[PDB]
Amino acid sequence: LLDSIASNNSAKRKDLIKKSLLQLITQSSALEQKWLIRMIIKDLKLGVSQQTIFSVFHNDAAELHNVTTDLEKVCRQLHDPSVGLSDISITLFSAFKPMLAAIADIEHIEKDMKHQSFYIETKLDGERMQMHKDGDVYKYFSRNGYNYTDQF
DNA sequence: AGACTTGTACTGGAACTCACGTGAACGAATGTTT
């Protein structure tokens, strides 16, 4: 039902969205409808961190989610708790969580660089993107893993 | 992006307890003086 509603919103159709929501309402209880509303809004407020959920799911799941950024692969590969992954590293056509930068104090900057020469670069204002190229197959991914390939 | 809230563990400090060391007093024995 959620897939139908999302695709149908993407297709510029509202009568079908109304039908799907009506079916969900008619075939749900008050608590189920409340939870469904929370998932639609994309907030649950469970009080438990996503990192905790991933850790309980498998020993090495946060790293795999960072490298891949797709709940399907993490859920599929990490099924048997005993069986782990030998080596996890960036792979083609799979979004990876970008590496960010933290505030720095000009006074102790040299100390933060272990008293060694460093690189100074200009700050760029705009979107953060990553490009995957294999032959003439191109994929573009945004900061959080959304696919912007259609635009570019 | 920035800022506040909740949590999380970790560090250090307060308090209690014991062991060890120092100070002072003392009863009995012994030596000296009359």
Q: What is the 3-state secondary structure (H, E, C) of A44-108?
A: CCCCCCHHHHHHHHCCCCHHHHHHHCCHHHHHHHCCCCCCCCCCCCCCCCCCCCCCCCCCCCCCC
Q: Which tokens in the block code for residue A143? A: 């900061």
Q: Which residues of A are known to be catalytic?
A: 123
Distance in Å from B9's C1' to A3's CA comes to 42
Q: Which residues touch strand B (CB under 7 A)?
A: A 100, 128
Nucleotides of strand B under 7 angstroms from a protein beta carbon: 1
Experimental technique: cryo-EM
Q: Which tokens in the block code for residue A134? A: 């294999």
Nearest residue: Cα versus C1' of B6? A47
Q: CA angle at residue A129 from A5 to A100, to 5 degrees?
A: 110
Q: Which nucleotide is nearest to A47 (CA to C1')?
A: B6
Sign of the torsion angle spanned by Cα atoms A46, A50, A55, A57? positive
SS3 of residue A128 by DSSP: coil
CB contact at 8 A, A68 and A74: yes
Report the run of H or E that residue A115 belongs to, with start and end. none
CB contact at 8 A, A81 and A105: no
The phi and psi torsions of A140 (rounded to 5 degrees) equal: -120, 135
- Resolution value (Å, 1 decimal): 3.3
Distance in Å from B1's C1' to A148's CA comes to 20
